[PDB]
Design a protein around this ligand. Structure first.
Ligand SMILES: [Mg+2]
Ligand SMILES: [Mg+2]
Ligand SMILES: [Mg+2]
Ligand SMILES: [Mg+2]
Ligand SMILES: [Mg+2]
Ligand SMILES: [Mg+2]
Ligand SMILES: [Mg+2]
Ligand SMILES: [Mg+2]
Ligand SMILES: [Mg+2]
Ligand SMILES: [Mg+2]
Ligand SMILES: [Mg+2]
Ligand SMILES: [Mg+2]
Ligand SMILES: [Mg+2]
Ligand SMILES: [Mg+2]
Ligand SMILES: [Mg+2]
Ligand SMILES: [Mg+2]
Ligand SMILES: [Mg+2]
Ligand SMILES: [Mg+2]
Ligand SMILES: [Mg+2]
Ligand SMILES: [Mg+2]
Ligand SMILES: [Mg+2]
Ligand SMILES: [Mg+2]
Ligand SMILES: [Mg+2]
Ligand SMILES: [Mg+2]
Ligand SMILES: [Mg+2]
Ligand SMILES: [Mg+2]
Ligand SMILES: [Mg+2]
Ligand SMILES: [Mg+2]
Ligand SMILES: [Mg+2]
Ligand SMILES: [Mg+2]
Ligand SMILES: [Mg+2]
Ligand SMILES: [Mg+2]
Ligand SMILES: [Mg+2]
Ligand SMILES: [Mg+2]
Ligand SMILES: [Mg+2]
Ligand SMILES: [Mg+2]
Ligand SMILES: [Mg+2]
Ligand SMILES: [Mg+2]
Ligand SMILES: [Mg+2]
Ligand SMILES: [Mg+2]
Ligand SMILES: [Mg+2]
Ligand SMILES: [Mg+2]
Ligand SMILES: [Mg+2]
Ligand SMILES: [Mg+2]
Ligand SMILES: [Mg+2]
Ligand SMILES: [Mg+2]
Ligand SMILES: [Mg+2]
Ligand SMILES: [Mg+2]
Ligand SMILES: [Mg+2]
Ligand SMILES: [Mg+2]
Ligand SMILES: [Mg+2]
Ligand SMILES: [Mg+2]
Ligand SMILES: [Mg+2]
Ligand SMILES: [Mg+2]
Ligand SMILES: [Mg+2]
Ligand SMILES: [Mg+2]
Ligand SMILES: [Mg+2]
Ligand SMILES: [Mg+2]
Ligand SMILES: [Mg+2]
Ligand SMILES: [Mg+2]
Ligand SMILES: [Mg+2]
Ligand SMILES: [Mg+2]
Ligand SMILES: [Mg+2]
Ligand SMILES: [Mg+2]
Ligand SMILES: [Mg+2]
Ligand SMILES: [Mg+2]
Ligand SMILES: [Mg+2]
Lengths: 93, 56, 135, 75
RNA sequence: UGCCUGGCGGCCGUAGCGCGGUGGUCCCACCUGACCCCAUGCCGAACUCAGAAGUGAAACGCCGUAGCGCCGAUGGUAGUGUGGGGUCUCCCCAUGCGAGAGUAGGGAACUGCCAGGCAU
RNA sequence: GCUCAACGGAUAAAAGGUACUCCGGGGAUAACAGGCUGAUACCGCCCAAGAGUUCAUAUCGACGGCGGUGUUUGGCACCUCGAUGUCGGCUCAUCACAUCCUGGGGCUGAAGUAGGUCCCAAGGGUAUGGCUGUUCGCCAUUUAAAGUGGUACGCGAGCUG
RNA sequence: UCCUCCUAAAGAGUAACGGAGGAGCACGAAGGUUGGCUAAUCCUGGUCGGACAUCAGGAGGUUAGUGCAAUGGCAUAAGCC
RNA sequence: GGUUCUCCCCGAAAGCUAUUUAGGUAGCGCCUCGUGAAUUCAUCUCCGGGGGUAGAGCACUGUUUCGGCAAGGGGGUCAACCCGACUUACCAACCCGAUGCAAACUGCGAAUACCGGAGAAUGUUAUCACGGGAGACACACGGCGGGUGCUAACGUCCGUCGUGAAGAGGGAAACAACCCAGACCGCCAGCUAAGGUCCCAAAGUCAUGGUUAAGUGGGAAACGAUGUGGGAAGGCCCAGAC
C-alpha cells in the first residue's frame, strides 16, 4: 500500500544506469500482463527505507508515475554485491 | 555533402589500425584540415579514430 | 583441516581473482558474515575462525561454513633455485571475491551473533562486514 | 621433473569459411572427428577431412534431428 | 472439396516424455498356419511365405491435460573493443558491442506431394 | 641390411685427469662486495582460548592476522674477469635506536631492598684472561654495564697472514 | 624423436628444467562388402550359486564399446554377430 | 681490438626451423636496389561465416556444504550357529531440495581478432612474383592476457601493441623504454599539446562554493578513536527529554 514516486527514464544502457546510480536514483522496470514494460527510476533513500520493513516484498505497491497511479507488486530485486545498496527492481503488475 | 575533418593529436604511439585509418582519411600532420564526403563509411572511420580527429 | 579427499590433478594454476562474487544472499541461516574485501582464505584461517566463533556462541545453534578450500597453493622450499619443476603442494586455499558469504549462523540472538562474528572476523585476512537475512 | 613432452600440433581447423569460392577437390575442414558432416557435394576423406567434390560456394548448414552441422557446396 | 488413414518428405524438442479418454466398414497392428521360397551360432520370436475367423488389449494414431522437459522477451548485471584516470594482485570515467542464469510469459507442433475410405 | 635412441643421422670405429698447467675470450656466466626483492630471519602491532589463588591484558600469551627493517639463510644475474684482495687479530674509529649502565617516569600479582614490564632519552661510558685460525662459544674472575647493528660481514696504496 | 589434452589469450601457430599422459607395435582377420543386431548399471525371481558366471522379465537410454594414452567423433553406427 | 674523405634517398632484426648447436651458420620472416603484373593491398560500412576464450552454469567428469527418507556397516533390553528380534539422539549409497569451485568440466556463450564478397573515398603500388646485395637470429621495458615465483624482483618464459634499440625536443628536479612529440636549414615572429602560473623558473598571490588543522598535501596496513563536514533512517522528548 506504499506510494512510491517514479520517473520515466529516457535512455538505457550501462552508461546511463551507472550515471543514475551515481546520482542516487536506481532504475527499475515494470512488466506484467499484455501491456508493454515501463522503464522507471526511483530514489534510493525512500526505497531502501521501504524495503527494510518486510511488507514491501509482501503486499500490493502503488507507483505514482506521471501522475497516474499504478498498482504493482515487487517481484525480483538485484541488490549490490557488497553493500547495503539496491541495483534494480523487477515489478509485476 | 562535404565535411571538414581536422587532426588534433598525433599518430606516434597508436595502433596499426589507427595509423591505417589516418592514412586512409589522408591527414598527415596535426592541424591538417581535409575535406571529405559523408558516407556511413567515413562516419565509421571517424567513429574509429574519434580520440584524435575533430569534425565540422 | 579442510581439504578435498580426492582430486583429479595435484598442482593447479595460479589464476587471477577478478570479478564479483556469487553467494551474496544469506540462504541457510539467519545471520551471515559477508566478505567485502578480496583475497584468499586458507584451511588454517577457516578452521581458526570456526573454532573461534564456536567458542563465542558456546556451541548453541547451527554454524554454516560456505566456502571450502579446494585450490592447492604450492611453495618451493628454501635454498632451492628457481628452475626444476613446479614446487611441492603444501596447503589449500579458497578464493574469495567481494560479496561471498563465508559463515552463517542461526539459533542465537542478534547481538550474540554480532559478537561472535566480530570474534571470528578478527582471525581472517579479508575485510568482512555483517549481514542479516532478507526476504 | 616428468613433464617436458608435448607433440607437434597438426594444424587442424577450418580452412575455407562459408562463402569462399572453392575450387574442386580443395580441402575445407581438417578435423579428427566428424565435427562437420558432409552434404550436397562434399566428400568425406579418410581422416574425416572434408573436400569439395564440385565447384561453388561453401555454405554451412545445421540440419538433421540431432543438430549436426553439415557442410554444403552451392554453385 | 470436410474429415480419417497409409507412404515419402520439409522441419528439429513450442516438435519430446507423462496422465486420462478414444478409433477397426477401410487402412494398420495383433492374429491363423507354415513340409514348404526363406531363417534361427537352439526356437516361424525375429526373417519369410501362404491367408482373413477375431480383436483394437498391446502397438500405432487422434483428443484433453501445465506434472516435467523445451522456448523466452523488456530491464538490469558480468564481460569487452577504443581513449583516459586511480587507492593499480584490482578497478573507475567517456564511448561502442552486450551475454549466461533467472522473470513476466509462451507452450500439448506446423507444412508439401501422392494414394485409399467415408455422402463431402 | 644401423635403439645411426645425442632420434635432420659429424666417423665403419673413441673414456678420463691436471692444484704442474698454457692461450684465446666473458661480468653474455659463477664465489666476496654492491643492487633489486623480503619467502625465511629479527623486532613490532591486531583478536583473545587459556595460565596467573577469583580475575583474558602485573607477566606470557595457543589457534590465526597486518606490518616494519634490510639484519641472518636465501632468490635474480643488473655493475666489475684489459682484475674491485674475500675470514680473524692489532690500530684507528664514526653513525643509528630496536638501550647494557647512568637520567626521567607510568603500571605492578610494587611493604622495604631486589625486581618484572612499558614510555621518553644516544651526552658519556661499555672487561681482563684459558682453549681454539676464529667471529661465535663455553669457562674463570671482575664491573655501574660488559649493548644490538651498519659502515665493501669498516679498515692489508695502515699492519699481520 | 613421435602422438593426445592444458598452458594457448573463441581461425592457424606460440615458450620454459611448466602441468598430466603414451608409443618404437598388433591384424591373412581385428581389412573389403552384404545381411542382421544394440549397450553400462540397477531391481525382481530362479538348481547347485556365493556382492559378482547362465536364464528370464523389467527400470535406464550411451552413464558401455573401439587391439592401445587422451582428445574429437560415432545409432545411418566408426560398436557387436 | 682496429678499419682512414663529403653529401643525398630508403632503412631493419634480436623471430621460426635445423644444427656436437646455443655468442657461429643456412633457408624463411623483416630491409634495400631493379623489372613486371592486375583495384593487386590497407582503413571503414553492409553481408557470408566457424569457434568455445572472458563471462556464466552444475545435465556430464570431479570436488563440496546443509536439509529431507533410506538400503547397507558399526552400540545393544533378550537369547546368542540358529531367528538376531528390536534400535539411541549413530554412520552412510542412489534419490530429491537448496548452496559454492574447476587449465586438463560444458545441457549455454559474447566483445575484439581472422577469412571471403560488394561499395565510396584516400594512400608517391603501399600488395604480389622474379633477380642482384645484405644485415640480423644476445633484445629491453611499459599496457593488457597468462605460465613460474611469494598475484616478490629493473626476475624468467610466451601472445599482441608501443617506445628505446636505430629518435632528437618538452614534462616527471635529476632519470634509454613512463606522458606530449617525430629534428631538411635559417628567423631577437605567432598559435598550441603533456605539464603548469607565489619565488628559484616562462605564465592567475585569477574568479565561484566547499573540505582540511594534520605540514595532511609531500612513503604505508590490520585495527582503534565523541577529530570534523554531509546525507538518510530513526527512539525518548514542551503532559518535561539527556
Ligand atoms: Mg563502460
Ligand atoms: Mg583468467
Ligand atoms: Mg571468477
Ligand atoms: Mg507370426
Ligand atoms: Mg489402445
Ligand atoms: Mg540485455
Ligand atoms: Mg538473456
Ligand atoms: Mg506441447
Ligand atoms: Mg501427448
Ligand atoms: Mg687466460
Ligand atoms: Mg652486460
Ligand atoms: Mg653475491
Ligand atoms: Mg621493504
Ligand atoms: Mg614473513
Ligand atoms: Mg587482570
Ligand atoms: Mg604483550
Ligand atoms: Mg603469534
Ligand atoms: Mg645492508
Ligand atoms: Mg650480469
Ligand atoms: Mg636476462
Ligand atoms: Mg659494483
Ligand atoms: Mg672480477
Ligand atoms: Mg682498468
Ligand atoms: Mg627511544
Ligand atoms: Mg616499571
Ligand atoms: Mg650513536
Ligand atoms: Mg646527538
Ligand atoms: Mg660491524
Ligand atoms: Mg652485510
Ligand atoms: Mg671487511
Ligand atoms: Mg655469505
Ligand atoms: Mg683484514
Ligand atoms: Mg685500502
Ligand atoms: Mg697460512
Ligand atoms: Mg587456437
Ligand atoms: Mg587466437
Ligand atoms: Mg550394414
Ligand atoms: Mg540374479
Ligand atoms: Mg568394419
Ligand atoms: Mg625515413
Ligand atoms: Mg620493433
Ligand atoms: Mg638434433
Ligand atoms: Mg646431431
Ligand atoms: Mg660461440
Ligand atoms: Mg572462468
Ligand atoms: Mg574452461
Ligand atoms: Mg630481394
Ligand atoms: Mg642462435
Ligand atoms: Mg635468440
Ligand atoms: Mg636469447
Ligand atoms: Mg623477448
Ligand atoms: Mg611485453
Ligand atoms: Mg602480467
Ligand atoms: Mg610475471
Ligand atoms: Mg626483464
Ligand atoms: Mg615483472
Ligand atoms: Mg626521447
Ligand atoms: Mg627531455
Ligand atoms: Mg621522479
Ligand atoms: Mg630536464
Ligand atoms: Mg621529419
Ligand atoms: Mg591545458
Ligand atoms: Mg637554477
Ligand atoms: Mg614569473
Ligand atoms: Mg586568488
Ligand atoms: Mg595512514
Ligand atoms: Mg535527568
Amino acid at each position: 500500500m506504499f506510494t512510491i514516486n517514479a520517473e520515466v527514464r529516457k535512455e538505457q544502457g550501462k552508461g546511463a544506469s551507472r550515471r543514475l546510480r551515481a546520482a542516487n536514483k536506481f532504475p527499475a522496470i515494470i512488466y506484467g500482463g499484455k501491456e508493454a514494460p515501463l522503464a522507471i527510476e526511483l530514489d534510493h533513500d525512500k526505497v531502501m527505507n521501504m524495503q527494510a520493513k518486510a511488507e514491501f516484498y509482501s503486499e500490493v505497491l502503488t507507483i505514482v508515475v506521471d501522475g497516474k497511479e499504478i498498482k504493482v507488486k515487487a517481484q525480483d530485486v538485484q541488490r549490490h554485491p557488497y553493500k547495503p545498496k539496491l541495483q534494480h527492481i523487477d515489478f509485476v503488475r | 555533402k562535404t565535411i571538414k575533418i581536422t587532426q588534433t593529436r598525433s599518430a606516434i604511439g597508436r595502433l596499426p589500425k589507427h595509423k591505417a585509418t589516418l592514412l586512409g582519411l589522408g591527414l598527415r600532420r596535426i592541424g591538417h584540415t581535409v575535406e571529405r564526403e559523408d558516407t556511413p563509411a567515413i562516419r565509421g572511420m571517424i567513429n574509429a579514430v574519434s580520440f584524435m580527429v575533430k569534425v565540422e | 583441516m579442510l581439504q578435498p579427499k580426492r582430486t583429479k590433478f595435484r598442482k593447479m594454476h595460479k589464476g587471477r581473482n577478478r570479478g564479483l562474487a556469487q553467494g551474496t544472499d544469506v540462504s541457510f541461516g539467519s545471520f551471515g558474515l559477508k566478505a567485502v574485501g578480496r583475497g584468499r582464505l586458507t584451511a588454517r584461517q577457516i578452521e581458526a575462525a570456526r573454532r573461534a566463533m564456536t567458542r563465542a556462541v558456546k556451541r548453541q545453534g547451527k554454524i554454516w561454513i560456505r566456502v571450502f578450500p579446494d585450490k592447492p597453493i604450492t611453495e618451493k622450499p628454501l635454498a632451492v633455485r628457481m628452475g626444476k619443476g613446479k614446487g611441492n603442494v603444501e596447503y589449500w586455499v579458497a578464493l574469495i571475491q567481494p560479496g561471498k558469504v563465508l559463515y552463517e549462523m542461526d539459533g542465537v540472538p542478534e547481538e550474540l551473533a554480532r559478537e561472535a562474528f566480530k570474534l571470528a572476523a578478527a582471525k581472517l585476512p579479508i575485510k568482512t562486514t555483517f549481514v542479516t537475512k532478507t526476504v | 621433473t616428468r613433464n617436458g613432452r608435448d607433440s607437434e600440433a597438426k594444424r587442424l581447423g577450418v580452412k575455407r569459411f562459408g562463402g569462399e569460392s572453392v575450387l574442386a577437390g580443395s580441402i575445407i575442414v581438417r578435423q579428427r572427428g566428424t565435427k562437420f558432416h558432409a552434404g550436397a557435394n562434399v566428400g568425406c576423406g579418410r581422416d574425416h577431412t572434408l573436400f569439395a567434390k564440385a565447384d561453388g560456394k561453401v555454405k554451412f548448414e545445421v540440419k538433421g534431428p540431432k543438430n549436426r552441422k553439415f557442410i554444403s557446396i552451392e554453385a
